[PDB]
Amino acid sequence: LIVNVINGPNLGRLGRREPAVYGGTTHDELVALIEREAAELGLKAVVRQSDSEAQLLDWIHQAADAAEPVILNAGGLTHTSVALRDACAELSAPLIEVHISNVHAREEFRRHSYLSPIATGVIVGLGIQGYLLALRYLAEH
Amino acid sequence: LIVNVINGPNLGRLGRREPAVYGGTTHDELVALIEREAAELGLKAVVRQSDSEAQLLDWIHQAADAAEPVILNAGGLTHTSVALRDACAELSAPLIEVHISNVHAREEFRRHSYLSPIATGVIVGLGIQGYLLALRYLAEH
Amino acid sequence: LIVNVINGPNLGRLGRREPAVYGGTTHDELVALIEREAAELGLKAVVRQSDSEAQLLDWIHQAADAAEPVILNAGGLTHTSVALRDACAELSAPLIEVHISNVHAREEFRRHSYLSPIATGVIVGLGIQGYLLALRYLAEH
Amino acid sequence: LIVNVINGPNLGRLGRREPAVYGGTTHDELVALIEREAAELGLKAVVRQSDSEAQLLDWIHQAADAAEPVILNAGGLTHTSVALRDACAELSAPLIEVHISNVHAREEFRRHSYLSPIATGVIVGLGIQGYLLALRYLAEH
Amino acid sequence: ELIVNVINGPNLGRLGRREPAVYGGTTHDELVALIEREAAELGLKAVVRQSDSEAQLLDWIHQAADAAEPVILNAGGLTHTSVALRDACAELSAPLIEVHISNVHAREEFRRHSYLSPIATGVIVGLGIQGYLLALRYLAEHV
Amino acid sequence: LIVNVINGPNLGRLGRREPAVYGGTTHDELVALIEREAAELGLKAVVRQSDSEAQLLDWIHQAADAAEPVILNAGGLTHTSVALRDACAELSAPLIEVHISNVHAREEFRRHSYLSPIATGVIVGLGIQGYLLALRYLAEH
Amino acid sequence: LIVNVINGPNLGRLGRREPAVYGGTTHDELVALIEREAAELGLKAVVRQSDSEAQLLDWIHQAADAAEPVILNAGGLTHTSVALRDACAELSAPLIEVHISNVHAREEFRRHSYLSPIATGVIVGLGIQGYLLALRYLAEHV
Amino acid sequence: ELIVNVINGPNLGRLGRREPAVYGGTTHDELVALIEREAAELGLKAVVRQSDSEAQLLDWIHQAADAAEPVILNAGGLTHTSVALRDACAELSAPLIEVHISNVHAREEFRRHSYLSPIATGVIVGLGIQGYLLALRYLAEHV
Amino acid sequence: ELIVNVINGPNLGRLGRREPAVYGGTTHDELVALIEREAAELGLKAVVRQSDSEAQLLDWIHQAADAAEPVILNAGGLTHTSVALRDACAELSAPLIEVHISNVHAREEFRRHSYLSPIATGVIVGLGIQGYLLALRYLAEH
Amino acid sequence: ELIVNVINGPNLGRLGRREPAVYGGTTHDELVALIEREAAELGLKAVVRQSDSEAQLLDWIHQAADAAEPVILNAGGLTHTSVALRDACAELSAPLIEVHISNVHAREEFRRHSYLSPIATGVIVGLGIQGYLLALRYLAEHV
Amino acid sequence: LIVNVINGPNLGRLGRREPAVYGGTTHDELVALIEREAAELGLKAVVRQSDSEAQLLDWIHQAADAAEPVILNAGGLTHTSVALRDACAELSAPLIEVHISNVHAREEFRRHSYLSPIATGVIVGLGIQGYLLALRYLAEH
Amino acid sequence: LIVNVINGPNLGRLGRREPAVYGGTTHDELVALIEREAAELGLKAVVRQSDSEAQLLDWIHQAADAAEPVILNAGGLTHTSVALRDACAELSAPLIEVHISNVHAREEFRRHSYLSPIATGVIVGLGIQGYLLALRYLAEHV
Ligand SMILES: O=C1C=C(C(=O)O)CC(=O)N1
Ligand SMILES: O=C1C=C(C(=O)O)CC(=O)N1
Ligand SMILES: O=C1C=C(C(=O)O)CC(=O)N1
Ligand SMILES: O=C1C=C(C(=O)O)CC(=O)N1
Ligand SMILES: O=C1C=C(C(=O)O)CC(=O)N1
Ligand SMILES: O=C1C=C(C(=O)O)CC(=O)N1
Ligand SMILES: O=C1C=C(C(=O)O)CC(=O)N1
Ligand SMILES: O=C1C=C(C(=O)O)CC(=O)N1
Ligand SMILES: O=C1C=C(C(=O)O)CC(=O)N1
Ligand SMILES: O=C1C=C(C(=O)O)CC(=O)N1
Ligand SMILES: O=C1C=C(C(=O)O)CC(=O)N1
Ligand SMILES: O=C1C=C(C(=O)O)CC(=O)N1
Ligand SMILES: [Cl-]
Ligand SMILES: [Cl-]
Ligand SMILES: [Cl-]
Ligand SMILES: [Cl-]
Ligand SMILES: [Cl-]
Ligand SMILES: [Cl-]
Ligand SMILES: [Cl-]
Ligand SMILES: [Cl-]
Ligand SMILES: [Cl-]
Ligand SMILES: [Cl-]
Ligand SMILES: [Cl-]
Ligand SMILES: [Cl-]
Ligand SMILES: [Cl-]
Ligand SMILES: [Cl-]
Ligand SMILES: [Cl-]
Ligand SMILES: [Cl-]
Ligand SMILES: [Cl-]
Ligand SMILES: [Cl-]
Ligand SMILES: [Cl-]
């Protein structure tokens, strides 16, 4: 039933943040779109956002304890955080990595995700809909 | 609206080919699943597979001229072919890269797609459903 | 005319912290010197320090919304944080990167700042006065 | 007299966290063993864990000001945090780096600790006892 | 009295017409005059020199080493290539400030690895023409 | 017992092709030598050559389904083709990589075969006899 | 005096293909322009294009057997194909590598040709005229 | 009507006696004469100059930028090492053709990474002396 | 009788006068006496041996593998270079503890990439001579 | 007739009990006897020698160079580390065949860059202990 | 027998230039020492110093034309100049590369001389006597 | 004044081994040439050669204890042995590295000596006279 959608640093800034790269959809609108999609798939979505690494670790620790699937857009921490990777290694339920922009069409340092090798799957560059497609995978699988 | 699903080398071997990596679904069954999904979304899917790089280039040139969206799993050529990349650079309509296995949880040489930097988006590790989720994105775009 | 001076990890430790590298000037002394210089330049300076990455992200988000220039010394996060770089990418007003020590005369890993490529300019190795020189540039711009 | 044992991200999760890698001992049980061993060696041990980088930095600053020895397991931050390295550089009393797992028998990125070069010594792969052996060194020195 | 050497390397005599979107529209002649005015306001005497010749640049910094005079150096393209220039700068006892008009870290990767930076007192980059003037102000506080 | 000898690009040119490197034996004479040696060992050798990657993949697919051993000299594709390595990964029967020249005594780029890590064994620099030695291995395995 | 001009993958697409990179001349027009220039220089150009590596290899083998010069634009295969390099190594008559675009002003991976080290020479970034200048090299060296 | 600058870098004045197995037996004087004869055939005016001095090469490039004239450049060894020379060439508005006598890709690895190639219009390598004349023919049909 | 083998490699017989700022002023003979005494208190028997010969070190490793005895190993310079010593240590079924006197990570870069660490049970570095004694304590508790 | 030197390096005397899943269950004594029989069937005389000492291996290679006898060499760990061994093998005028029991390319990265491979006639890898026998068969044919 | 001793950039600064690295012997004193050694060996030695690359090339050109041996300390140009290497490649008589300091005990960028591979031999770290020893080599050869 | 000349692996093979690389002078002739030159300089030279790393380490240890200068040609071990480098780090008297061939004109892996950074100086490619020139340095520096 329960799917955890977790957004990392700078993702609360969606809308005004680099619109050509990330789109004009706000995080509030993102939460509403995910919840609407989850209800139509018979799931429950809990969407959380934080710039704090310690907060992100706490949320996925809880998902590990509850054995709930995780949709994770770690933002910049994707490319840098071993600590977040280590937390995500506790997850028994599927972990789907999601990025709004095509991370492979940008700077070289964005192409070597710490999370990708331990995630079930990755969706990149499909904009805001990437979250919704990740939800659909978890509902159908 | 026509969507081109193009599969590269060894993808015609699906089902028998490394089941633990790629799953047990055959390419014939994949064709049927895509065509069923496309019919629900109001799209028309043309699914084709070849082990020949020249044939993949020909199919991509046609999609460039017709300005039709492309879903591409180039198999091994993903990691090697600059020629295929150059063919895909002609596409005006969206290009979605799809991989059945999590290419980032495997050998290091699989983590550096030549196609990702020029694709609209990439779906990795979500099995056969990656194709179907790519169709849904294209149904909204 | 508001200018934000943002200091990152370990900069609150100035004075006793590696004196041969960073000097004997405390953070409070630095705060006083900046405010004195800004007042003589007709600017208002707001100087804040935190060891928390999430906190630094918060302050630059504010400067982005208020369209205010930023003088940033991110400390160790300079060399490691993509998340901080992403937050700084929102800034429409000039961003000046400042370092007290000559970061190129030290360990090799300190020579590859994530912030330099997206900043307007960089001042390195001029001690505390680096902040004051960054202020003077902003007074003319 | 006073020894500071500081544990980084995900080390509060010991016990159920990757048992085959880190063992079945919880953090509560680890605190008890450390306190019992320190009392036998005529020392007082202060054991603290946090997933927050800023919190770790705060604890290091206090040890530097008090000139107290530090036994540090930074977790995933060991491989990533220059900020934590910088704080540890202020320590006048010995710094012993400790890891539960053999960090050299794992992923390549775990083999290049930021703390190792500025530490007095490093104990790796000797399990929970690594903490206790580090205590014994400090009792002799 | 208190003398500061401002030394510009290859292609810096071309300022104004040369890639204006990268280096600005101020000519080198205008830069010389601007530096001299700012220096005199700070109680300093700026000696501003430009050469496309490495040997000439070496000679100038050799003299600054003998006279123990501060140096503000924009070596241009040589910044990224010349060990010889670095070796000469290693003799300087008075402060050495490396200045670049453009933000070299926002450009090609080969520009991000200065040979001079590790032996300089400090580096000012990407602050345009004012970087020279700010370097002078540092030296005015550091006699 | 059937053994498949598969020769890749440029190997049909044996005889005239860089005689100092690859020898003076033609490809037709190679077929005759292998077939004579196979009859002596009580094996059945099918020797085939193609410059077409797709054709080589098809022959490997057939050997995978038939559970037949493969002796493969992929020529230039040894160093470049992930697609060919992917086809060879299907083989349940032993795969033995053969090269006429000493590929380690030439250009550096010839030293990093994609096939070697998944082959049973490799024979290099022993000339045309390398094929015959490979047959002899398979006759006892 | 026969000269083989061989074009690799995606070069049949000249005209529509990234005009800002490769120009607006079509492959049909390219063929005819090469043939006319060759004829004026007292040569005969055989111009062929294929997206198939095996086909390109066959044309190179034939050129090696006939000891005819090759002007080669391998396209994408320039940066990736050892098999093509191996075939070209059999050439004894001059081999000239030609690229329409300045391959050094683009992505890094385009700057490390497998063909360059074994070719007589390389012409890059001079557009369609690169083929014609390669022909003139051959005509001036008879 | 069109003026083209042929600029040769370090060691190119040594052509003829210099490593003949690599650069051929044509002297620099003979090269000048061959270029001027080809330029006269194409209806162009060719000015051929050679120097071992980097500063001198930079000066000639600056003049070509100011005059908006095409440049055929063989920088010799400086091709692989000089950012200063690259920066001067970036100021050119008329076409820049990089020319090398030897096949620079069939030699040492350090010769395969020209600083000038990315900012040039085109590059001709390994065709010997004729590389200069072919570069002239390109400029005759375009500029 | 639980036998622990303490094996020292090249230049460790030179302890005392050998770079005292790096390795301390304790001689190898004094080290042997300290290890043996510490082993006695823990209820173990320590066999301490040193050789500058790689072949000799390999023989001692082979013997310890056949006897299923724990090994405390300071391979010296060979730590950073010897695949052969790694291959021998791979036979050990009983725990292998890598010990270095100096902090090998605070020194030259080539000292930071041990061939032995990835196959050892654990590693003790930079704790001086006491690193041997702590390694014994680990084995006594295990 | 023809004398063939089969030289095994460090840890190969441990075959049988040493990592059976990697190197097989055949002991070194069993390997020696097998090689001797196979060679005698081919009209050759195999001298099989093993040592953990680099110096000892060098001496045996020196003797083969002076006698111009072929060498089959499994240097073990020294394959990936010893320039001294490569230098000794460079003296051999008769064929040198490098042999490894395990597929060294299916293992750790540091095992994939043999110092001996570039100077050997050929290499046999991953075919078990039969690799020695196939190497013998090559030498009997040449050649 | 005439020997050319050629010193490059910064070598005219000997004596006062980094005494701990290059010693206290001036360039004028070096010239006098070479004169004495040349007289003892029975040869002529011409000592030239220039900070100009073009000048150094000219002197090398003259030595090539006269087939005279060269002792070269190119200073900083040793590590940077392909042009100087190309000039030295013309020399038919022996070329001895000489450095006063041990270039291998300093910065990494000093360990990759462009001249070494085309020189007859190299003398490094023997101070000023390196010049005198190089002269003795040329007298005997 | 006693000077130690130490030759590593394969240097006993001089005259036989790759004569186009190392020359036609035997190690015995080298010994005699060194002893003659030492007598001219008022020095005593002890020239010893071994293919064994352990034996070379022992000789270096002896030279460290006696505070005697060392001329060292480690051969192949030059590029591989941290153990030998560690032994040489004990030397208080000067250490001169010598190579007969120009190590920088050969394979890349020969250009990164472990001994060079800790030696007083390095002499390369001056053939047999490299040893004699090394002797003259030590005689001039008392
Ligand atoms: O590297 C990234 C990628 C992001 C995305 O595409 O979702 C967001 C972000 O803040 N940082
Ligand atoms: O590297 C890959 C990845 C594939 C996938 O995951 O779809 C298929 C394939 O043949 N080769
Ligand atoms: O790498 C750095 C550089 C700093 C500076 O020079 O201001 C401060 C800091 O905490 N970490
Ligand atoms: O890379 C590591 C190593 C750990 C350890 O071995 O203690 C713990 C951790 O959380 N992350
Ligand atoms: O790489 C650079 C940087 C320059 C600057 O920014 O001042 C000038 C220049 O000529 N070359
Ligand atoms: O790299 C190689 C090696 C070959 C061989 O040695 O058989 C053949 C080939 O066409 N390309
Ligand atoms: O890398 C390239 C270069 C091309 C060219 O410039 O001719 C063509 C092409 O298809 N791929
Ligand atoms: O690297 C090079 C190449 C040259 C050429 O081929 O023209 C000439 C030169 O002096 N140095
Ligand atoms: O690299 C090392 C480290 C040693 C240690 O710290 O014990 C000893 C040694 O001889 N070589
Ligand atoms: O790297 C290796 C490979 C071996 C083999 O496969 O024969 C043996 C060995 O001791 N070390
Ligand atoms: O890199 C070096 C080395 C020098 C030497 O050791 O003679 C002199 C110099 O100016 N630059
Ligand atoms: O790398 C080398 C260099 C040698 C030399 O030139 O003296 C000798 C040797 O056996 N190995
Ligand atoms: Cl988007
Ligand atoms: Cl697209
Ligand atoms: Cl991806
Ligand atoms: Cl799957
Ligand atoms: Cl300071
Ligand atoms: Cl400490
Ligand atoms: Cl300074
Ligand atoms: Cl900077
Ligand atoms: Cl500007
Ligand atoms: Cl052959
Ligand atoms: Cl297999
Ligand atoms: Cl080119
Ligand atoms: Cl000893
Ligand atoms: Cl173990
Ligand atoms: Cl460690
Ligand atoms: Cl041989
Ligand atoms: Cl192999
Ligand atoms: Cl020479
Ligand atoms: Cl050297």
Q: What is the CATH number of the domain that holds D52?
A: 3.40.50.9100
Q: Do K124 and L129 touch (CB under 8 A)?
A: no
Give strand pairing partners of A44: A2
Q: Which residue in this structure is represented by tokens 């890269």?
A: B97
- Residues of G with a known catalytic role: 22, 99
Determine contact, residues L39/L32, Cβ cutoff 8 Å: no
**Determination approach:** X-ray
Best residue among B13, B72, B96, B100 to mutate for probing ligand 2, ranked by most atoms within 8 Å of CB: B100
Determine contact, residues D126/D94, Cβ cutoff 8 Å: no
Q: How far apart are CA G79 and CA G103, in angstroms?
A: 10
Name the strand (E) or helix (H) holding L47.
strand L44-49
Q: Order of strands across the sheet with J71-74? A: F44-49, F2-7, F70-73, F95-99, F121-124, J122-125, J96-100, J71-74, J2-8, J44-50
* Min Cα separation J133/chain F (Å): 9
Q: Please give the angle made by the CA atoms of A8, A14 and A20, to the nearest 5 degrees.
A: 120
Determine contact, residues L40/J114, Cβ cutoff 8 Å: no
- The DSSP string of B17-85 is S-HHHH-S--HHHHHHHHHHHHHHHT-EEEEEE-S-HHHHHHHHHHHHHTT--EEEE-GGGGGT-HHHH
Q: How far apart are CA B81 and CA G74, in angstroms?
A: 13
Question: What's the half-sphere exposure (Cβ side, CA atoms, 13 Å) at F132?
Answer: 21
Is H59 flagged in the annotation as binding? no
Residues in chain I preceding a C-to-N separation beyond 2.5 angstroms (breaks): none
Of K134, K121, K7, K26, whose CA–CA distance to L136 is shortest?
Answer: K134
Give strand pairing partners of D7: D49, D73
CA distances for D40 relative to D37, D71, D132, G9, angstroms: 5, 17, 11, 76
Phi and psi for K105 in degrees, rounded to 5? -100, 10
Phi and psi for J58 in degrees, rounded to 5? -60, -45
Q: How far apart are CA J103 and CA J125, in angstroms?
A: 5
Q: Do B136 and A136 touch (CB under 8 A)?
A: yes
Q: What token pair was written down for F58?
A: 């098809």
Name the strand (E) or helix (H) holding H128.
none
Pocket of ligand 10 contains residue J77 by CB under 6 Å: yes
- The DSSP string of E50-101 is E-S-HHHHHHHHHHHHHTT--EEEE-GGGGGT-HHHHHHHTT--S-EEEEES
> Best of F96, F104, F108, F112 to disrupt the J interface by mutation (most J CBs within 10 Å)?
F104
In chain F, what are the helix, strand and coil shares in percent, each to the nearest 5?
A: 45, 20, 40
CA dihedral (L118, L123, L128, L133) in degrees, to 10, reads -100
Is D73 flagged in the annotation as binding? yes
Of K115, K53, K103, K109, whose CA–CA distance to K78 is shortest?
Answer: K115
* Rg of chain E, C-alpha, whole Å: 14
Nearest CA to ligand 6 atom 9: F75
* Min Cα separation C85/chain A (Å): 8
Question: Which DSSP category does G55 fall into?
Answer: H
Total residues found in chain F within this entry: 141
The two beta strands, G70-73 and G2-7, are: parallel
Q: What token pair was written down for H32?
A: 């000048």
Of K27, K33, K12, whose CA–CA distance to K135 is shortest?
Answer: K33
Nearest CA to ligand 9 atom 8: I76
K neighbour chains, 3+ CB pairs within 8 Å: E, H, L
Domain count, chain F: 1
Q: How far apart are CA C70 and CA C131, in angstroms?
A: 11
Of I25, I7, I21, whose CA–CA distance to I106 is shortest?
Answer: I21
Is the backbone of residue H25 left (phi > 0), alpha (psi -120 to 50) or beta? alpha
Q: Which residue in this structure is represented by tokens 């007299």?
A: D1
Q: Which atom, in ligand 7's list, is nearest to the CA of G10?
A: 10
Determine contact, residues D84/D114, Cβ cutoff 8 Å: yes
Q: Which atom, in ligand 6's list, is nearest to the CA of F102?
A: 6
Q: How far apart are CA B122 and CA B139, in angstroms?
A: 16
CA distances for J59 relative to F99, G81, J65, J66, J81, angstroms: 31, 44, 10, 11, 18
Q: How far apart are CA H136 and CA H32, in angstroms?
A: 13
**F125 Cβ contact list (under 8 Å, min separation 6):** F99, F100, F101, F102, F103, F104, F105, J120, J121, J122, J123
Phi and psi for A25 in degrees, rounded to 5? -80, 130
Phi and psi for G62 in degrees, rounded to 5? -60, -45
The two beta strands, D70-73 and D95-99, are: parallel
**E80 Cβ contact list (under 8 Å, min separation 6):** E110, E111, E113, E114, E115, H83
Of D18, D9, D13, D16, whose CA–CA distance to D101 is shortest?
Answer: D18
Determine contact, residues C101/C123, Cβ cutoff 8 Å: no
Is G86 flagged in the annotation as binding? yes
* Containing structural domain, residue A127: 1-141
The two beta strands, K121-124 and L121-124, are: antiparallel
Pocket of ligand 7 contains residue B90 by CB under 6 Å: no
Q: How far apart are CA I127 and CA D122, in angstroms?
A: 8
F42 touches chain J (CB under 8 A): no
Q: How far apart are CA C44 and CA L32, in angstroms?
A: 83
Of E72, E70, E23, whose CA–CA distance to E50 is shortest?
Answer: E72
SS3 for G70? strand
Question: Which residues lie with the beta carbon below 6 Å from any ligand 2 atom?
Answer: B 10-11, 73, 75-76, 78, 99-101, 103, 110; F 86
K104 touches chain L (CB under 8 A): yes
SS3 for I82-100 is CHHHHHHHCCCCCCEEEEE
Other Cβ atoms closer than 10 A to G62: 12
**H66 Cβ contact list (under 8 Å, min separation 6):** E17
Active site residue D131: no
The residue type of J16 is G
Determine contact, residues J104/J124, Cβ cutoff 8 Å: no
Question: Which DSSP category does H82 fall into?
Answer: -
Give strand pairing partners of I60: none
Q: How far apart are CA C33 and CA G131, in angstroms?
A: 67
E1, with CB counted inside 10 A (0-12, 13-18, 19+), is: exposed
L122 touches chain I (CB under 8 A): no
Q: How far apart are CA F130 and CA J141, in angstroms?
A: 12
**B67 Cβ contact list (under 8 Å, min separation 6):** B92, B93
E68, with CB counted inside 10 A (0-12, 13-18, 19+), is: exposed
G touches L (3+ CB pairs < 8 Å)?
Answer: no
Q: How far apart are CA K75 and CA I90, in angstroms?
A: 49
Determine contact, residues K1/K43, Cβ cutoff 8 Å: yes
Residues in chain B preceding a C-to-N separation beyond 2.5 angstroms (breaks): none
SS3 for A97? strand
Q: Please give the angle made by the CA atoms of I72, I77 and I80, to the nearest 5 degrees.
A: 85
Is the backbone of residue A95 left (phi > 0), alpha (psi -120 to 50) or beta? beta
CA dihedral (I71, I75, I76, I77) in degrees, to 10, reads -160
Active site residue C141: no
Q: How far apart are CA K11 and CA A135, in angstroms?
A: 70
Q: Which residue in this structure is represented by tokens 């559970």?
A: F67
Q: How far apart are CA G38 and CA G35, in angstroms?
A: 5
Phi and psi for I98 in degrees, rounded to 5? -85, 125
Q: Order of strands across the sheet with H44-50? A: G44-49, G2-7, G70-73, G95-99, G121-124, H122-125, H96-100, H71-74, H2-8, H44-50
Q: How far apart are CA C44 and CA C3, in angstroms?
A: 6
Other Cβ atoms closer than 10 A to H105: 21
Q: How far apart are CA L29 and CA L16, in angstroms?
A: 13
Alpha helices in H10-129 (DSSP H): 20-23, 28-42, 54-67, 83-89
Nearest CA to ligand 8 atom 8: H76
Of B74, B26, B85, B131, whose CA–CA distance to A123 is shortest?
Answer: B131
Q: How far apart are CA F46 and CA C122, in angstroms?
A: 68
Q: What token pair was written down for I15?
A: 């302890």
F81 touches chain B (CB under 8 A): yes
D13, with CB counted inside 10 A (0-12, 13-18, 19+), is: buried
Number of H helices, E strands in chain A: 5, 5
Determine contact, residues H32/H74, Cβ cutoff 8 Å: no
**F19 Cβ contact list (under 8 Å, min separation 6):** none
Give strand pairing partners of D62: none
In chain C, what are the helix, strand and coil shares in percent, each to the nearest 5?
A: 45, 20, 40
Q: Do G65 and F10 touch (CB under 8 A)?
A: no
Q: Which residue in this structure is represented by tokens 């509850």?
A: A66
Q: How far apart are CA A8 and CA G65, in angstroms?
A: 63
CA distances for E19 relative to B15, E12, H82, H89, H97, angstroms: 59, 11, 18, 11, 20
From the candidates E23, E28, E115, E132, give the one annotated as an active-site residue. E23
Residue of chain D minimizing CA distance to I105: D117
CA distances for L132 relative to H43, K19, L98, L117, angstroms: 66, 28, 10, 22
Q: Do F53 and B50 touch (CB under 8 A)?
A: no
F125 touches chain J (CB under 8 A): yes
Of H61, H122, H129, H55, whose CA–CA distance to H89 is shortest?
Answer: H61
Of L29, L40, L51, L28, whose CA–CA distance to L3 is shortest?
Answer: L40
Q: How far apart are CA J27 and CA J23, in angstroms?
A: 10
Residue of chain H minimizing CA distance to K90: H18
**B31 Cβ contact list (under 8 Å, min separation 6):** B47
Q: How far apart are CA K96 and CA K116, in angstroms?
A: 9
Q: How far apart are CA C61 and CA J73, in angstroms?
A: 66
Q: Do L53 and I51 touch (CB under 8 A)?
A: no
A90 touches chain D (CB under 8 A): yes
Q: What token pair was written down for E72?
A: 């503000």
